[PDB]
Amino acid sequence: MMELHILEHRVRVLSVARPGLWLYTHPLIKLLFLPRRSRCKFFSLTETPEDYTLMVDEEGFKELPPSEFLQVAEATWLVLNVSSHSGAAVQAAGVTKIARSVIAPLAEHHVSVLMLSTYQTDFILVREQDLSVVIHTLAQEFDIYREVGGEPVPVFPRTQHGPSPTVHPIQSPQNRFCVLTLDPETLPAIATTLIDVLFYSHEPSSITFFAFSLIEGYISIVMDAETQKKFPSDLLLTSSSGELWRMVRIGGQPLGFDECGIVAQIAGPLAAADISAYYISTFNFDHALVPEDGIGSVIEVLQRR
Amino acid sequence: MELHILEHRVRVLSVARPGLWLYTHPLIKLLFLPRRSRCKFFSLTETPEDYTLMVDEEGFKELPPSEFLQVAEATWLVLNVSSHSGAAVQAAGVTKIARSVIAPLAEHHVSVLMLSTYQTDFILVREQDLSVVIHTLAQEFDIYREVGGEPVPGPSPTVHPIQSPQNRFCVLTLDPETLPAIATTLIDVLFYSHPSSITFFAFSLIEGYISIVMDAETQKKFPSDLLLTSSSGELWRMVRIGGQPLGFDECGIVAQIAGPLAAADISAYYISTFNFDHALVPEDGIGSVIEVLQRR
Numbered sequence: 230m231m232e233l234h235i236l237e238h239r240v241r242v243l244s245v246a247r248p249g250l251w252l253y254t255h256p257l258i259k260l261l262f263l264p265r266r267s268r269c270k271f272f273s274l275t276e277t278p279e280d281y282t283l284m285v286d287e288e289g290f291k292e293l294p295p296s297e298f299l300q301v302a303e304a305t306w307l308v309l310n311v312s313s314h315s316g317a318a319v320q321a322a323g324v325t326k327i328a329r330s331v332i333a334p335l336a337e338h339h340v341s342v343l344m345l346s347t348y349q350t351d352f353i354l355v356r357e358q359d360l361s362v363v364i365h366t367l368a369q370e371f372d373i374y375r376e377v378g379g380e381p382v383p384v385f386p387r388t389q390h391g392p393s394p395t396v397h398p399i400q401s402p403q404n405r406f407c408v409l410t411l412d413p414e415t416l417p418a419i420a421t422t423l424i425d426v427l428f429y430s431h432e433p434s435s436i437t438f439f440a441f442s443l444i445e446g447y448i449s450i451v452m453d454a455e456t457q458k459k460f461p462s463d464l465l466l467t468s469s470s471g472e473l474w475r476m477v478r479i480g481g482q483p484l485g486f487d488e489c490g491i492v493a494q495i496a497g498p499l500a501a502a503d504i505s506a507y508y509i510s511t512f513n514f515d516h517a518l519v520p521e522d523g524i525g526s527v528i529e530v531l532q533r534r
Numbered sequence: 535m536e537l538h539i540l541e542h543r544v545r546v547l548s549v550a551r552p553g554l555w556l557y558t559h560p561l562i563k564l565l566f567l568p569r570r571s572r573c574k575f576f577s578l579t580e581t582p583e584d585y586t587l588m589v590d591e592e593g594f595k596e597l598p599p600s601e602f603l604q605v606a607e608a609t610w611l612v613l614n615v616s617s618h619s620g621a622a623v624q625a626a627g628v629t630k631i632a633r634s635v636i637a638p639l640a641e642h643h644v645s646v647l648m649l650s651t652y653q654t655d656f657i658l659v660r661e662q663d664l665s666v667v668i669h670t671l672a673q674e675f676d677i678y679r680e681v682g683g684e685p686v687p688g689p690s691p692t693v694h695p696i697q698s699p700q701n702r703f704c705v706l707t708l709d710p711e712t713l714p715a716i717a718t719t720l721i722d723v724l725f726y727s728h729p730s731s732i733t734f735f736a737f738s739l740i741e742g743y744i745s746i747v748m749d750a751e752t753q754k755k756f757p758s759d760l761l762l763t764s765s766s767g768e769l770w771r772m773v774r775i776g777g778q779p780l781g782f783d784e785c786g787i788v789a790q791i792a793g794p795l796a797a798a799d800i801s802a803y804y805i806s807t808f809n810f811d812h813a814l815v816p817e818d819g820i821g822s823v824i825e826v827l828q829r830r
């Protein structure tokens with residue numbers, strides 16, 4: 230009934246250490262602001278305290294020179310997206326809704342995922358080495374398509390052994406986050422501010438977290454409510470005003486890319502509690518965004534897991 | 535009749551094009567984020583050969599050394615002529631000080647660099663020469679040194695070829711509060727865009743005043759009704775001066791360009807870059823200009 234789409238993106242996952250970010254100002258600004266200057270169709274940049282995580286298609290990857298500040302995940306990642314029958318886009322912040330149908334099945338079959346929720350939709354990245362299993366695992370409950378050119382197309386055999394799944398500690402900083410979009414034609418108007426925030430910036434427990442993605446021409450931004458005050462008024466867009474979000478940071482040790490079942494151990498319980506959630510993986514840690522009014526509940530759900 | 539020594543200590547550098555990317559982070563700051571640096575004198579000129587930078591010491595601190603960055607040896611001071619009570623003189627007035635400033639400094643072996651902007655004409659001199667400068671200019675000018683914002687009271691000369699590309703140039707200013715609105719475009723032009731025409735683009739932010747020199751074709755790329763220009767109609771043609779890099783020691787080059795133009799009563803902006811000199815003259819007069827300058 231429901232459809233699962235394999236998008237036409239081959240994605241690399243990278244981490245830029247803060248002290249070296251300046252070195253990559255020239256390519257990044259290009260990828261951020263000059264769509265006529267590159268062939269990139271998948272760009273995601275997330276600032277955390279640890280680093281800047283990049284998820285970029287191969288075309289954008291060509292723009293980033295190697296250095297001691299740039300760590301590159303070894304695998305190439307494919308991008309999955311759930312939609313409804315006939316191809317209608319499903320509501321955003323729906324990571325918990327696919328907890329039983331996508332996340333848990335993939336975890337059970339030892340498929341490691343990376344999550345990238347955006348304003349528009351929820352992307353699930355899987356290593357190309359696992360594609361067959363993915364299909365095998367999800368063909369029962371989804372009609373699977375491959376996006377060839379611009380239109381859909383109906384659809385090594387050893388899943389590697391990962392480390393033993395464990396329970397990971399969680400933290401909840403006090404920041405109030407917003408999920409916003411933007412008319413691309415207005416991106417220049419915020420450019421300088423965005424640049425200032427990404428490249429030249431930097432007790433209540435708070436975290437530095439700022440996500441900007443440009444994917445198939447769609448812009449998505451996750452930012453602190455205070456950071457939004459820095460931006461020109463009446464440009465940042467959201468269809469549900471007053472909706473602010475609290476973050477649950479998942480991980481004590483860096484999580485790597487081999488352990489499975491982390492997203493599942495967060496989204497399962499939240500799904501059972503009927504709580505909506507965005508979910509964004511960075512190079513080292515996971516991040517869930519839940520409605521602020523429910524944060525307490527969420528914590529209690531996650532501490533008895 | 536006043537000569538002001540401004541409170542700027544300036545370094546003159548050249549970034550080779552293949553290395554420009556390395557300096558995107560500092561330059562953007564200096565271009566667009568005034569709250570993030572103490573720099574008060576910033577000039578960036580793109581030429582076919584390089585990007586010439588003139589930056590005060592604070593801005594100089596932001597620029598890491600590399601194989602693409604040439605640095606002129608001396609520290610330069612900034613001179614500016616003004617009227618009876620500090621009132622500013624007309625812009626494009628390099629020729630109007632040909633007799634009173636440029637020629638005397640050349641005669642006393644003081645090497646200069648010129649930086650004309652939309653607002654005024656700056657004359658840079660190596661600090662080691664300051665005394666001579668005073669000794670030369672005290673007779674005709676009341677000399678004031680700017681302190682805390684208040685005015686407190688070589689090689690053998692050589693012939694240089696001249697060339698006039700066909701670009702029509704505009705000298706423009708901008709309200710700083712509108713600088714964000716053009717940022718991306720400006721960035722695209724400076725950092726991501728790279729014959730009887732030349733590649734020449736000047737941007738300066740000096741004491742909060744913005745000045746831009748660009749060809750009309752480049753002006754079409756910018757959002758309309760933001761770039762400001764007082765007198766319009768007749769744009770400017772460039773005369774490029776030099777057949778090989780001119781260095782910083784030879785004197786009398788500016789004098790041999792601005793002197794004759796002064797005698798012909800022709801106005802001119804004048805911009806020195808790391809390697810060559812550039813005069814901007816009214817376009818409809820280019821023929822006359824070339825005739826005046828080749829009387830030699």
Ligand SMILES: NC(=[NH2+])NCCC[C@H](N)C(=O)O
Pocket residue numbers: 340341342343344484485486487488489490491492493510511512513514515
């Ligand atoms: N670097 C990371 N964020 N790793 C954790 C991502 C989620 C984990 N691979 C899972 O399948 O549940």
Ligand SMILES: NC(=[NH2+])NCCC[C@H](N)C(=O)O
Pocket residue numbers: 644645646647648780781782783784785786787788789806807808809810811
């Ligand atoms: N790099 C240069 N632009 N050099 C020439 C500057 C003018 C010359 N020093 C003069 O005093 O007349």
